Design a protein around this ligand. Structure first.
Ligand code: ORN
Ligand code: ORN
Ligand code: ORN
Ligand code: ORN
Ligand code: ORN
Ligand code: ORN
Ligand code: MN
Ligand code: MN
Ligand code: MN
Ligand code: MN
Ligand code: MN
Ligand code: MN
Ligand code: MN
Ligand code: MN
Ligand code: MN
Ligand code: MN
Ligand code: MN
Ligand code: MN
Lengths: 298, 298, 298, 298, 298, 298
């Protein structure tokens, strides 16, 4: 299936500037060339125009920083993504902080009876204005897409929820706020924290993950946050957490998903060139994209 | 169970100065805060006064450097640890080179019918004045505790031995002197060198270890030497050995022990701030302690 | 005098992508805050729209890569810069590769009887299509501004030349092509290579430079290329050259210029976040700007 | 069985100079001392005289660079190795780029009814003048040994092929040329790329490998290319490829081979002191040799 | 003149923990051995007992954090230093944060008609409760010793001021608060910020400094703050500032003072092992002490 | 004047192995290409055959380790160098540890009425068997050349002394043994330790040096030891000493010597690839040679 790249230069979902440079950092890391080599009909639809956020002061919720700019950008993203899917193409969204997942899922989900989600991340991203300790919207996209949160975020695309909790699998988690641990526990979301990764091994985690979703979804969206990898492998992220997944574990995961042929959409987020070591993180993202799309060693 | 921290600023067990700053480096790394967050009644009993060693030439044995000072300090430690156990608390000892294990086990063992020991280390620490290639007492605490060595070390606390060989499990070993290899073989001590860890995996090593000790002990003392971790993960150690356990393997181990609920006392040794990279090692120790005491990602 | 910031996201002057992110990396490095603190009326006019280069094979000259896009973007820059000068403000241009100097000088020069130029760089940037060993226009802005080269570059702004050779001072040079060595020698351009900086000292080089230009110009434009600093100090540059000026030498230079009150316009170029170590270079640029604009330690 | 060391200061198999210093770097890394400690009768037969290759433009060799010099050096190596085997000694060849495998296998294979080969590498080394993308002979030794390629290479030692495809096992492969992927596919060579290593684990890979060859060979030659390890573990290699085998995985592999007692000859190649970090790579090689030859932690 | 070392394990003058380990970090870096080699009668009087500070809450001034504990420790220090001077020995105080300068000068000054001070630092340390932006007493010792500040600090030793502004020379300054710039300007304190160091050179700065003080003092106290050096040379400091003095500039300074024979007392402060890279900073301090005390290359 | 390169793969002058690889490391660092570009008639005479030194316990040489092998290799070097000078060529010797200076000066000095020597080093190399603290002959070449030491070393070439003390200038010295300090003092050798370099500046030191020797010699031999540069600039050296000359100071020195046209012979020693960071040190050497031979920035 032909691919369509959409860049979302977003940084309003959090506070470290530079994550808005992720789309071009990955383009510069050679994402087009990489995918063209795999004989893909790759197309670059450019970037979603993001508006500058109103200053905190006259702005409404500190528990929902930059809500309007974030909500509007995601509206545009949802539309762009919706059209790509309608055109029969695979939407590959490049971020940008994780709050863009709200728009990506808003444009994809409407097209599936039961869309599953693989949330590759160090965080759960299931906070609300009530549970969020930062007010950073990049820490709320999964909950908002599950129908939990401010209507400005939950109603993107004119419908909700975008997905069901039983159709979500979290991988590489190692930093959850108390409210989030409770949310995960109660909504019954499937999750493999680093303990399970260390205990079971990435192979078993991926096998179980793929089998689980394949048995109850009709499309799977890969929401890959680069901070899911160890800061040593992916240094250029705004909210890094030590003791993460390795470069190899990430490739195996992508390779196993490629093989499974279950990934119907994807987004690579949180790449921040301004916090990286010579574009290393964008590079990792591009390599991981290659594996996801079927690149093989043999 | 409430915890009691006892710092043992000891460096007389070896030759690299600075390991005596380990207790405070770990305190500065945030051990109290870490444990309080887990809802523990934590208490800091301060440090064991360590005397200074007498003139080397007017000392008794070259194969037992600083024997007088090491033996006396361990006497004090044993008493302090004994008291804590009597009070119904968990003794958490912060070192300090590994020679302090002699005092810790001396105050703990007397309280158990069959105390088991998990020795997480790159070394076996089963040398005697005869087999020791250095004369460094930090390389003799396990043998001494098993009743093998100079009476000045074997009789700490007025009894011996503190433990039985069949109740000991060595993990992470990758540097044994010939005499020690023979000792381990002959005393029949259970051991998982890096080969076994590489071959079986930390999960299997921990499963087997926990099952073994649980089936024949009434209390388990964790003697964790930071040099058990690779120098890249734990640079601040006096006698580093490459090709060690990773940060993740160490957390999984602690996590599986917490789960097992078998650890009745513990000590984290060999942290040397003066050989470290910005208190990295003291930090690792504190994090591993959090896991040991039940900290979880989810 | 109020300042006006103009970003020129240009990378068509050379081949390393990412230098187009220099303007925003410097903004993120805090250029506005830095200057506001010095009590300046600072204004950000945004960025100059840069078009994309046409197919290489259907381009006109290999010795003048991306001539069309580079020349047109420089036209826009010249206009913007011209306007700022007319408004009574100081034009502070943020790049972007060094080819943007062509546009900056084009909008500034017309306003001075004898505009002088201080070219802080590891290179001379005095190549033509004939002498250029790369075809990279970022290696031709000084010659072009002096009236030497392709008319598409020499006629920007509708006039030429922008400056006279006798009003130019090169500082920090350590990498000149043969053609350029000849050019400098023959046009009689004042130059202080690293040898002179090492032999005389930055203080003497700056004293001599300031005295020279002050005695025969009515305005001085500072064209500061970050690669003028050693790659250890400024790692984020496309064409680094070892054995460059230090961080301290650069601050002293800016500090002595501020003192002299001779700089009437400036530009900081070649900052490439994608080749940097955590925005270090953009940071250096911002600090040097603070000094240029009068920031003092006491 | 007594060991005989033969250094092959070869770099004509590729383009990065310095790999000819590999033999002395490893000797200086202490190969003799290491092996003597395991009570071996170790002997150093010095180095094979390598003749400088004539100008590429003068002698016909571009898809086969330095063919004459590489073919003759390998002739000498073949003889030296043949003689060592005849004397009842184990031939331990120290390289030198991988093209020397052609000579080593040429001197060993004639002595076995069915010699197996474990090719520990990031590459397949199964290119021919037709499929080679570089013309570097170090990328053709395995194919040439299997009887595929220029006669100057396939006929070394007066016979061919030296081995059969079904008796070859590739391990750690992560960089194969298209022609090579096809070669491996069609010749039916058993291969464990990094995907299999990540998926199955080194233990499994080694178990399967040892059992496979043990069931159908009468001798097994270990051709270990240091670039099979990750560049972070083995930095001093000419053609590094990221996402490689770890230090520990390599020790386990060597340890399990020692155990199986199947390795009848070996060569450690691609060590280049001039691209390394303080002889780190030669050191890893020496250590790995210690394990291969039975060195144990316990 | 014989030397007497007094360690002041102080960290209450600021907020980064670990600076209290500076005395032993320097002892471990070999300060005694170093000075003994220069044939000195060196004596170690141990450490000043420092009391733990009352918690901020019930504590008085936030503008004067830990005032009572800091004031009391300095009382003890002043007494210890006073006696050393009385015994005809040179007081060498090892810190500990800079707030200890209050006690050192309190014990020395009473013994001189006109005691001069060389304040080697990145900061001015001339803040008061009114001008301090942090409330950190380590940022007030020079002003307090000049008679400016809270009486609890200005009256240490029962007299004030300890020195006159005209007898003070600041060197390496590059980070002054506004109040401090004003204080320096108005009290007329002689100061060489990094601008003067870069402009004049360390040699001229030291020549001018030595001549100035020698012409109007009867004793000179060297208050050396390790953060006066660049964080690359002295990484282990709590409040580092980039663009500092080099290792060589520091040795030249010490060498030139040794030669001048004007230093009658000294203290090396701010060494923090917990923020350093393998005791590098304590090491630099010990080497600098060697030069100060006459160690020479020839 | 045409240049003749002679490699001397010597490491018997000290204990760190690998320095025998210095000649090829520099050749690989591009010494020929570098010099040819300056339009020189460069010729490579290969390497001097060095014989392995017999066991320390078997042949009498401990205050003079490897004396036989070092004395004879230097005999051969002396002849080779003598012949090059006779042919009217400039002898450029590539080492190899510093003991090779004995042979170089032995072949050059006989051709000059008053040969001067610039000894660029961190050491003085003026030890004798009596004063040597190591027994390493690389610490005795200058004394031996001045006619002080074992006859096996002082009589190389059939004559002595090769030079007079008043015609020697040491530069960059920062590590002298007591006997050496006395030797320099008494023989009245002109010396610029790092104190003088820091105090006067490299320009001044070089000006004074050139003028001194130019006024009283008829030829000047440059004996450049790479360890004269700081270990950060030249890491690959066996006996590094911190606080050394910078890369720039070395280039200025070489540049000023080229200018003076006084250097009639030279040798670059102590390059050890096995202790370096990717041939960095050989590279600095090559670069420094380029300058010495007239390479210029402009
Ligand atoms: N996307 C990262 C979220 C980080 C954190 N858990 C928060 O809610 O602020
Ligand atoms: N604590 C490390 C012990 C090191 C060695 N086995 C010895 O006994 O010296
Ligand atoms: N801006 C760097 C210029 C590099 C070189 N002189 C060239 O013209 O290619
Ligand atoms: N031994 C490395 C070979 C790399 C590549 N397949 C080539 O043939 O050039
Ligand atoms: N001793 C450092 C003082 C730091 C700062 N100027 C302050 O007053 O907080
Ligand atoms: N060339 C280095 C010599 C170092 C020391 N002076 C010695 O003679 O051992
Ligand atoms: Mn996320
Ligand atoms: Mn995340
Ligand atoms: Mn231990
Ligand atoms: Mn240990
Ligand atoms: Mn430029
Ligand atoms: Mn440049
Ligand atoms: Mn290979
Ligand atoms: Mn390979
Ligand atoms: Mn201070
Ligand atoms: Mn300071
Ligand atoms: Mn030397
Ligand atoms: Mn030297």
């Amino acid at each position: 299936k032909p691919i369509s790249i959409i860049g979302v230069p977003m940084d309003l979902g959090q506070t470290r500037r530079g994550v808005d440079m992720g789309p071009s950092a990955m383009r510069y890391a050679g994402v087009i060339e990489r995918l063209e080599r795999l004989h893909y009909d790759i197309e670059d639809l450019g970037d979603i125009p993001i508006g500058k956020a109103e200053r905190l002061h006259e702005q409404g919720d500190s528990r929902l920083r930059n809500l309007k700019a974030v909500a509007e950008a995601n509206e545009k993203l949802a539309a762009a993504v919706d059209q790509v899917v309608q055109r029969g193409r695979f939407p590959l969204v490049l971020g940008g902080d994780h709050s863009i997942a709200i728009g990506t899922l808003a444009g994809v989900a409407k097209h599936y009876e039961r869309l599953g989600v693989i949330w590759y991340d160090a965080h759960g991203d299931v906070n609300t204005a009530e549970t969020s300790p930062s007010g950073n919207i990049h820490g709320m996209p999964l909950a908002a897409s599950l129908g939990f949160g401010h209507p400005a975020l939950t109603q993107i695309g004119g419908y909700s929820p975008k997905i069901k909790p039983e159709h979500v699998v979290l991988i590489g988690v190692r930093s959850l706020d108390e409210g989030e641990k409770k949310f995960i526990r109660e909504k019954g979301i499937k999750i493999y924290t680093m303990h399970e990764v260390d205990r079971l091994g990435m192979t078993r985690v991926m096998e179980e993950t793929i089998a689980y979703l394949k048995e109850r979804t009709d499309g799977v969206h890969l929401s890959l946050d680069l901070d899911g990898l160890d800061p040593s492998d992916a240094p250029g992220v705004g909210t890094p957490v030590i003791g993460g997944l390795t470069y190899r574990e990430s490739h195996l995961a992508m390779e196993m998903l490629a093989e499974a042929q279950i990934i119907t959409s994807a987004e690579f987020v949180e790449v921040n060139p301004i916090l990286d070591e010579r574009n290393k993180t964008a590079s990792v993202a591009v390599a991981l994209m290659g594996s996801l799309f079927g690149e093989k060693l043999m």
